[PDB]
């Protein structure tokens, strides 16, 4: 009775069609949902925004177990696929938007799961045009401002800060080496 | 014992616990579950005693008891949890159900207070300081998650009700109010001394528990050492807590050492230790508390156990003080315990320095203390050859372990001669002489100290003999009863290996008949608990095996003992015979443990005989007549019925096998055969039937056993059942010795079995086999509930004596098992004997075994039988028996056995049993028998076994190719060809007699499948055997199709064997016969399809229900059962006959009818989805697979045609690829011509030899594999009935039908077939667009896991890629692939070196890698490769 293509499988499929076909990454990047298109959708938002906010973050109650590994694969593929700048710029812009959104979010384990998962996707992407874009957009400076937008007493705060330090170390090294 | 007396006494309770398991621990867990939810002191006493019990269900209560206002109980709970974590990992392994609530409560106790740096040092927390020299935040609560309270004194009452009032005034986080309670009770405590010390102590306990299982910091060691320095002397319990914490922290060690000062003689810890010791020694100076001293000597133990600490204890010279302890301390139990602690420390310290110990004469001090303690036992137990207090026994044990270690240590090798001229032997003499006052492990340590000394200085064994220590050891280990334990038994032979070492010692050892005494251990129930396997995971008899290997080492050092050892072994065997022979004993699972004796003795003898593999013990034993007493053990009357399957019988068989394989001696088999012939001659009344209406002889011997409650336990009550179970044990020994691969042992086995006695036994075993099949089938006929018999008193007359049904069954079941298990062992024996016979006397062995096969197949019951089923069940097991004996695993025959099975008989009887089984004894002819209504119940099961045998008998590809062929040469020479002539001729008539009749209720599809396999083998074989009756197979292949299609209507699963039969009839006959077959199959499909096309016209007039009837009529009409096999047959035929069957499927137009049927069924299936009662027509998958392979075949014919258009039909040059040079080197002309000819024939693979190397080509992969090396190398062919395929109007209808079948989730296997078809069709983007324009990706996403299959996600991904790949995107992706393959030297499964630059880069190879892309689209691949290469 369970659906045969869970969102995990659909993500792996899209990751494959991105890695093969040039236009798919740009079409997925520009495609955006509409208000009241699904129960989980509150307002017009990009697919990348939804993948960053609702599918990528670890959450304690399962719907599919391995949705996050495959949204990470999907966004990794959408980066690695060169697709000129049409796909990579919208990916980076949407990651920046979801970071600022989650930092403005109210203090919650939802906030820390979103933050940790965005740091993890920046780290996987980071593992050269993506780095050029991360510099141009000031993503490193928005990562460094992360603790300004934390409650420094939270029991999660150290884990989300570790996560945000992980791309900062790699990026500062790759720049100044 | 006194524990049980204490339990009964307790069961004023608290007064008794103040004076000082399951139901006492349960009453404790009771009051724990009661008090935590004249009480508190009861809880405290229960705890204070339990903290002794664990040191030699409560958890969930104890964890709640930490929420106490009076810290005394918190402390006691911690002391108990410390005793736990110290001794065993009981709380570490526990689950997080309560481990985390516990460990968190402990963390909240343990967590720091700010230490010295904030004025909360433990030293300052323990000195009073006036309560005004502490930080003002001490009497203050500051709990955050917000609560702050300046001081707790104005509300000092009721801290628990304070916490509950805070529960009501504030919402305290759930499940973490413990950190509040501990802060509040602390802030109440700190005001006063006792409560502050109790908080300190609780914190120290909590640390220690948290370390035996963020808390630790730089100042903690210094704080603890300053607690130890505090000299008010009222703190000794806090000092002991601090030391126990330091102990936990050892498990920072350099800091512990730097603070305590152990690196120097002057230093706080060493000085404290020396003052404790001096206070313990001298009575005037008061003694430091026992608890504190124990914490000190435990800390020294754990510190010494680590190298940094042992080196520090060297440096401060603690050995001098500890030897002072071990020299001057008194006799009382606590002082003894401090002595054993000091001894274990002197052990750890001497594992890295000896010089201090030696310079302090420590060995003399140890020996004097051993003298003093032995002198204090001498008063209690003065006996010496001319209970010990536990603490003294532990002292002695640690001190003898030290002496053994020192003897095995240099720095005593000079001087250890002067140990045994001390008092030591006079005190060992007392331990050895009193192994019952002193423990057995202490008696062991004493004999091992002597053994290790004698191995260090064998010279001074003369001194030990002069003072008679060896003569006391002998008396204590032989003449006095050996203490019954594994370690003592394991050591006796090493001890005797020492005592023999002086030759005088050997004389003394052999003087006292040592092995008569030593081996009695194996026949004594007192030592069976010592012999029982430890951990239940070491082998059975592991300890007797060790003992035997040690006695082997002993008497290989001292060969003079070998003869007496083997004499005492043979006396063991003769006594086991005695205990098994006379009636007065009865084997327990008077009861006697005989089977344990037999296992232990046999593991002992096995170890001895097989240890060195020098065949000196085997020879001696056989020459001392031990094989008679050995082999008799199998036949012992009073051994139980379940003996033969037991590990003791397998042990006896293993000893026989060891003797056979070491000595190469026939005598084991000769003697086994003599005794087996003796037993078989006893039970000839089993061969003679009742000779009246009667049942089993075993059940007439049972029933006539008077009324004894259990006859089967008596050898006189059931003589035949016990001779059965003796023969079974002998047969399992012959099995074990036949399961041998040494050709020499095989040869001497066969030479023995071929003897006059061997063949007398083998004849009697054959008659026994047929008697046991009779008896077992009669007995099962009597345990059946009055169904199988024909209402007759066949064995009832004896069941009426035996006895309301179970009361009779449960007396027969021991007979049934004793007779059925023996039959299976006989069959195993004869199979092994056939293997040995095949690989002159073998020929007589095989003769007697084929006379058994004839006897079994021609056996007829007595004429009093109530039903033929007893004969059919005899025949079924005779056939299932003859199969293993004529044919190996992998189904190759033994030609010696087929020769004798033919010449002697059994082939005419094998086929006569078929005629008999069908005719029912001639009552009905065979041609009417099968279809007769009154055919016996088991005639389908017999025919299943008979047909499965004949399938093996007929196959030429094994009967001619068998590895087990006879050599080429007085004897009649065998021909497997004439054997197949007569067998196929005899089989064909019987199959005729079953060809068309309706199948049996059960065992009819296995009958049909083996009958069809026989026909296939005959039809393939006659072409090959006429090379070295044809019109009968001709007319058969003409008329067979009515029967084939009858079989497809009755038993669809036979269709694969019907395909193979039709293919062999085709390869016999011409294309004129292929056409007739294919047109007839196609006409059956045609009419079955057209009736379903008329079955689904929309039901306008409503005559039928038009909903449930119509939906299920399409799926259930007989025609819809036919199609599922007529199409499937046609598809298998198509797969083999690729192009003729394609051209017929084209020219008949049947494909249009099947497309029309797939279209017309869609309204029905859709309506079924709307009934929510989908039930998929099974015929859909054959049709989709047929269409799939029809268009696969047409693809391929066009590609092969235009390939032929580019090839010369003469000498097509095949070339093999040399990756190293990059050359397509040609084959020789004969290899090239062979490969081309065999590719053109369509063979999948071709074998050839070049340079005597064996090469094979695989045209599936186009690879040459070298058969010797397995190297795979690429090959190429050097280039220089037209199947129209599916038309657009068919493809359009198929795509719509596949989308509708995806809409309604028809079935998993049907979705797989329809998606496979879509995958083939959509490879043209026009049809992929059609498939995507009909909204099929929504259906695919909606599909539930009930409608899924292994390939679903790959296949769906490929389909979606087919939708995505329009001409331009496919071109650009092909460009990416071509560039990637040309730039990167890709590896392959053709040994093309990875990232090679010759082989990986040839155009002719790269085109082979890119072949999948060329198939994806060849035109586009040309355009791309022309533009990018």
From Swiss-Prot, chain A:
Localization of this protein: Cytoplasm; Nucleus; Mitochondrion
Top-level taxonomic group: Eukaryota
Changes after translation: Phosphorylated on tyrosine; phosphorylation is probably required for its ability to inhibit TP53 transactivation.
Tissue: Weakly expressed in heart, brain and placenta but not in other tissues. Expressed in a number of cell lines, predominantly in those from colorectal carcinomas.
Illness association: Intellectual developmental disorder, X-linked, syndromic, Turner type: An X-linked neurodevelopmental disorder with highly variable clinical manifestations. Common features consist of moderate to profound intellectual disability, delayed or absent speech, short stature with small hands and feet, and non-specific but recurrent dysmorphic facial features such as macrocephaly, microcephaly, a broad nasal tip, deep set eyes, epicanthic folds, short palpebral fissures and a short philtrum. Patients may manifest other features, such as hypotonia, seizures and delayed bone age.
Subunit-level organization: Interacts with isoform p14ARF of CDKN2A which strongly inhibits HUWE1 ubiquitin ligase activity. Interacts with MYCN, POLB and CDC6. Interacts with isoform 2 of PA2G4. Interacts with NR1D1. Interacts with AMBRA1. Interacts with HAPSTR1. Interacts with HAPSTR2. In hepatocytes, interacts with PAQR3; the interaction promotes PPARA poylubiquitination and STUB1-mediated degradation.
Similarity comment: Belongs to the UPL family. TOM1/PTR1 subfamily.
Function: E3 ubiquitin-protein ligase which mediates ubiquitination and subsequent proteasomal degradation of target proteins. Regulates apoptosis by catalyzing the polyubiquitination and degradation of MCL1. Mediates monoubiquitination of DNA polymerase beta (POLB) at 'Lys-41', 'Lys-61' and 'Lys-81', thereby playing a role in base-excision repair. Also ubiquitinates the p53/TP53 tumor suppressor and core histones including H1, H2A, H2B, H3 and H4. Ubiquitinates MFN2 to negatively regulate mitochondrial fusion in response to decreased stearoylation of TFRC.
Domain commentary: The HECT domain mediates inhibition of the transcriptional activity of p53.
UniProt-recorded name of the protein: E3 ubiquitin-protein ligase HUWE1
Native source organism of the sequence: Homo sapiens (Human)
Full-protein positions shown: 2062 to 2259 of 4374
Curated annotation (Swiss-Prot), chain B:
Post-translational modification: Phosphorylated on tyrosine; phosphorylation is probably required for its ability to inhibit TP53 transactivation.
Location in the cell: Cytoplasm; Nucleus; Mitochondrion
Modified residues (Phosphoserine): 536-537
TM annotation in the entry: none
Tissue/organ expression: Weakly expressed in heart, brain and placenta but not in other tissues. Expressed in a number of cell lines, predominantly in those from colorectal carcinomas.
Record domain WWE: where: 1200-1277
Role, per record: E3 ubiquitin-protein ligase which mediates ubiquitination and subsequent proteasomal degradation of target proteins. Regulates apoptosis by catalyzing the polyubiquitination and degradation of MCL1. Mediates monoubiquitination of DNA polymerase beta (POLB) at 'Lys-41', 'Lys-61' and 'Lys-81', thereby playing a role in base-excision repair. Also ubiquitinates the p53/TP53 tumor suppressor and core histones including H1, H2A, H2B, H3 and H4. Ubiquitinates MFN2 to negatively regulate mitochondrial fusion in response to decreased stearoylation of TFRC.
Entry note about domains: The HECT domain mediates inhibition of the transcriptional activity of p53.
Protein family according to the UniProt entry: Belongs to the UPL family. TOM1/PTR1 subfamily.
Disease: Intellectual developmental disorder, X-linked, syndromic, Turner type: An X-linked neurodevelopmental disorder with highly variable clinical manifestations. Common features consist of moderate to profound intellectual disability, delayed or absent speech, short stature with small hands and feet, and non-specific but recurrent dysmorphic facial features such as macrocephaly, microcephaly, a broad nasal tip, deep set eyes, epicanthic folds, short palpebral fissures and a short philtrum. Patients may manifest other features, such as hypotonia, seizures and delayed bone age.
Record note on quaternary structure: Interacts with isoform p14ARF of CDKN2A which strongly inhibits HUWE1 ubiquitin ligase activity. Interacts with MYCN, POLB and CDC6. Interacts with isoform 2 of PA2G4. Interacts with NR1D1. Interacts with AMBRA1. Interacts with HAPSTR1. Interacts with HAPSTR2. In hepatocytes, interacts with PAQR3; the interaction promotes PPARA poylubiquitination and STUB1-mediated degradation.
Protein name: E3 ubiquitin-protein ligase HUWE1
């Amino acid at each position: 009775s369970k659906p045969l293509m869970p969102t995990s499988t659909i993500l792996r499929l899209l990751a494959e069609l991105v890695r093969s076909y040039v236009g798919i990454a740009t079409l997925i990047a520009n495609y955006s949902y509409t208000v009241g298109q699904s129960e989980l959708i509150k307002e017009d938002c990009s697919v990348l925004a939804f993948v960053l906010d609702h599918l990528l973050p670890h959450t304690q109650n399962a719907e599919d177990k391995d949705t996050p590994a495959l949204a990470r694969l999907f966004l990794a593929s959408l980066a690695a696929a060169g697709s000129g700048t049409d796909a990579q710029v919208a990916l980076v812009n949407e990651v920046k938007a979801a970071l600022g959104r989650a930092l403005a979010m109210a203090e919650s384990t939802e906030k820390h799961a979103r933050l940790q998962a965005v740091m993890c996707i920046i780290s996987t992407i980071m593992e050269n045009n993506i780095i050029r874009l991360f510099l141009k957009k000031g993503l490193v400076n928005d990562l460094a401002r992360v603790p300004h937008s934390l409650d420094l007493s939270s029991p999660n705060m150290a884990n989300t800060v570790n996560a945000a330090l992980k791309p900062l170390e790699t990026l500062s090294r790759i720049v100044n080496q | 014992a006194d524990c049980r007396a204490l339990i009964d006494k307790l069961k004023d309770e608290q007064l008794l616990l103040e004076l000082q398991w399951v139901d006492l621990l349960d009453r404790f867990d009771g009051i724990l579950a009661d008090a935590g939810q004249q009480l508190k002191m009861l809880l405290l006493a229960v705890l204070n005693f339990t903290a002794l019990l664990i040191e030699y269900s409560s958890i969930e209560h104890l964890t709640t008891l930490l929420a106490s206002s009076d810290m005394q109980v918190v402390l006691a709970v911690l002391n108990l949890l410390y005793v736990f974590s110290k001794r065993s990992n009981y709380i570490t392994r526990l689950g997080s159900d309560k481990r985390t609530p516990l460990l968190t409560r402990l963390q909240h106790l343990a967590e720091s207070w700010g230490g010295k740096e904030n004025g909360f040092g433990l030293a300052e927390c323990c000195r009073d300081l006036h309560m005004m020299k502490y930080p003002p935040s001490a009497t203050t609560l500051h709990f955050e998650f917000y609560i702050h309270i300046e001081q707790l004194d104005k509300i000092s009452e009721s801290p628990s009700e304070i916490m509950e009032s805070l529960t009501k005034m504030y919402s305290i986080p759930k499940d973490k109010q413990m950190l509040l309670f501990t802060h509040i009770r602390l802030a109440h405590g700190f005001s006063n001394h006792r409560k502050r010390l109790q908080a300190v102590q609780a914190r120290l306990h909590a640390i220690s528990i948290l370390v035996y299982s963020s808390i630790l910091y730089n100042g903690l060691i210094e704080e603890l050492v300053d607690v130890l320095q505090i000299t008010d002397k009222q703190l000794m319990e806090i000092k002991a807590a601090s030391l126990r914490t330091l102990t936990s922290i050892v498990h920072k060690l350099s800091s512990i050492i730097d603070c305590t000062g152990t690196a120097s003689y002057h230093g706080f810890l060493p000085v404290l230790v020396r003052n404790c010791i001096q206070a313990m020694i001298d009575p005037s100076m008061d003694p430091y508390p026992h608890q504190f001293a124990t914490a000190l000597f435990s800390f020294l133990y754990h510190l010494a156990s680590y190298d940094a600490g042992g080196e520090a204890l060297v440096s401060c010279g603690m050995m001098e003080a500890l030897l002072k302890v071990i020299k001057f301390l008194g006799d009382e139990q606590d002082q003894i315990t401090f002595v054993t602690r000091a001894v274990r420390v002197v052990d750890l310290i001497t594992n890295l320095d000896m010089a201090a110990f030696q310079s302090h004469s420590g060995l003399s001090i140890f020996i004097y203390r051993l003298e003093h303690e032995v002198d204090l036992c001498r008063k209690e137990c003065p006996f010496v050859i001319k209970q010990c207090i536990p603490q003294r026994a532990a002292l002695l044990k640690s001190m003898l372990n030290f002496l053994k270690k020192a003897i095995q240590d240099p720095a005593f090798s000079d001087g250890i001669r002067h140990v045994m001229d001390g008092s030591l032997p006079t005190s060992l003499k007392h331990i050895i002489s009193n192994a019952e006052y002193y423990g057995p492990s202490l008696f062991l340590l004493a004999t091992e100290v002597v053994t290790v000394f004698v191995f260090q200085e064998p010279s001074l064994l003369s001194s030990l003999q002069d003072n008679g220590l060896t003569d006391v050891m002998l008396h204590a280990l032989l003449i006095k009863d050996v203490p019954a334990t594994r370690e003592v038994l394991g050591s006796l032979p090493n001890v005797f290996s020492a005592l023999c070492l002086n030759a005088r010692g050997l004389q003394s050892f052999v003087q006292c008949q040592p092995f008569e005494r030593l081996f009695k251990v194996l026949l004594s129930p007192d030592y069976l608990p010592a012999m029982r396997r430890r951990r239940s995971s070491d082998p059975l008899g592991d300890t007797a095996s060790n003992l035997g290997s040690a006695v082997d080492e002993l008497m290989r050092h001292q060969p003079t003992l070998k003869t007496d050892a083997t004499t005492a072994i043979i006396k063991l065997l003769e006594e086991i015979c005695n205990l098994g022979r006379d009636p007065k004993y009865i084997c327990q699972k008077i009861p006697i443990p005989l089977m344990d004796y037999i296992l232990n003795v046999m593991k002992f003898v096995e170890s001895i005989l097989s240890n060195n593999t020098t065949d000196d013990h085997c020879q001696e034993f056989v020459n001392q007549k031990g094989l008679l007493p050995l082999v008799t053990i199998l036949g012992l009357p009073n051994l139980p019925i379940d003996f033969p399957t037991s590990a003791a019988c397998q042990a006896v068989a293993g000893v026989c096998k060891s003797i056979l394989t070491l000595s190469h001696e026939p005598k084991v088999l000769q003697e086994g055969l003599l005794q087996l012939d003796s037993i078989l001659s006893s039970l000839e009344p089993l061969h003679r039937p009742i000779e009246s209406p009667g049942g089993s002889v075993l059940l007439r011997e049972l029933a006539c056993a008077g009324n004894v409650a259990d006859a089967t336990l008596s050898a006189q009550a059931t003589p035949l059942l016990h001779a059965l179970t003796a023969a079974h044990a002998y047969i399992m020994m012959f099995v074990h010795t036949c399961r041998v691969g040494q050709s020499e042992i095989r040869s001497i086995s066969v030479n023995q079995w071929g003897s006059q006695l061997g063949l007398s036994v083998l004849s009697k075993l054959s008659q026994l086999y047929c008697s046991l099949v009779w008896e077992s089938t009669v007995l099962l006929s009597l345990c059946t509930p009055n169904s199988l018999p024909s209402g007759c008193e066949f064995g009832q007359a004896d069941m009426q004596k035996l006895v309301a049904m179970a009361a009779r069954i449960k007396q027969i079941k021991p007979l049934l098992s004793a007779s059925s298990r023996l039959g299976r062992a006989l069959a195993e024996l004869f199979g092994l004997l056939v293997k040995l016979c095949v690989g002159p006397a073998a020929r007589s062995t095989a003769s007697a075994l084929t006379k058994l096969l004839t006897k079994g197949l021609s056996w007829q019951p007595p004429p009093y039988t109530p039903t033929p089923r007893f004969r059919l069940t005899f025949f079924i097991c005779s056939v299932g028996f003859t199969s293993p004996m004529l044919f190996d695993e992998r189904k190759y025959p033994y030609h010696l056995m087929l020769q004798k099975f033919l010449c002697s008989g059994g082939h005419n009887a094998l086929f006569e049993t078929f005629n008999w089984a069908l005719s029912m004894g001639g009552k009905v002819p065979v041609s009417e028998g099968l279809e007769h209504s009154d055919l016996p119940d088991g005639t389908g099961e017999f025919l299943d076994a008979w047909l499965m045998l004949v399938e093996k008998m007929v196959n030429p590809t094994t009967v001619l190719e068998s590895p087990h062929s006879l050599p080429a040469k007085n004897f009649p020479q065998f021909s497997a060809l004439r054997f197949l002539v007569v067998t196929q001729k005899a089989a064909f008539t019987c199959i005729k007699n079953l060809w068309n009749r309706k199948p049996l209720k059960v065992y009819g599809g296995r009958m049909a499948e083996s009958m069809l396999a026989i026909l296939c083998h005959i039809l393939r074989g006659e072409p090959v055997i006429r090379e070295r009756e044809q019109d009968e197979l001709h007319t058969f292949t003409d008329t067979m199709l009515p029967g084939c299609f009858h079989l497809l209507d009755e038993l669809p699963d036979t269709v694969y064997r019907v395909c193979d039969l039709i293919m062999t009839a085709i390869k016999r006959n011409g294309a004129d016969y292929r056409d007739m077959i294919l047109k007839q199959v196609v006409n059956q499909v045609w009419e079955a399809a057209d009736v379903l096309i008329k079955a689904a016209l929309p039901l306008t007039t409503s005559d039928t229900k038009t909903v449930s009837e119509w939906i299920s009529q399409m799926a259930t009409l007989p025609q819809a059962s036919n199609l599922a096999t007529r199409i499937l047959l046609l598809t298998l035929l198509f797969e083999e006959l690729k192009l003729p069957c394609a051209w017929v499927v084209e020219s008949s137009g049947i494909l249009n009818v099947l497309i029309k049927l797939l279209e017309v069924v869609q309204p029905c299936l859709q309506a079924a989805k709307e009934q929510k009662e989908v039930q998929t027509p099974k015929w859909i998958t054959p049709v989709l697979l047929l269409i799939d392979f029809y268009e696969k075949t047409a693809i391929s014919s066009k590609r092969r045609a235009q390939m032929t258009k580019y090839l010369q039909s003469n000498s097509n040059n095949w070339r093999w690829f040399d990756d190293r040079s990059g050359r397509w080197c040609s084959y020789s002309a004969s290899n090239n011509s062979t490969i081309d000819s065999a590719w053109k024939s369509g063979e999948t693979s071709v074998r050839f030899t070049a340079g005597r190397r064996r090469y094979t080509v695989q045209f599936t992969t186009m690879v040459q594999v070298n058969e010797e090396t397995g190297n795979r190398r690429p090959v190429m062919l050097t280039l220089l009935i037209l199947i129209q395929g599916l038309t657009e109007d068919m493809v359009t209808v198929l795509i719509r039908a596949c989308v509708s079948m995806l809409g309604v989730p028809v079935d998993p296997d049907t979705l797989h077939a329809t998606l496979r078809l879509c995958l083939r069709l959509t490879r043209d983007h026009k049809y992929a667009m059609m498939f995507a324009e009909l909204k099929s990706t929504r259906m695919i996403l909606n599909l539930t896991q009930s409608s899924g299959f292994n390939g679903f996600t790959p296949l769906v991904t490929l389909l979606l890629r087919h939708i995505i790949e329009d001409p331009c995107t496919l071109r650009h992706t092909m460009e990416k692939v071509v560039r990637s393959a040309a730039t990167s030297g890709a590896g392959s499964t053709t040994s093309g070196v990875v990232s090679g630059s010759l082989g990986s880069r040839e155009i002719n190879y790269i085109l082979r890698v890119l072949g999948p892309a060329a198939c994806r689209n060849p035109d586009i691949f040309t355009e791309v490769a022309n533009c990018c290469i």
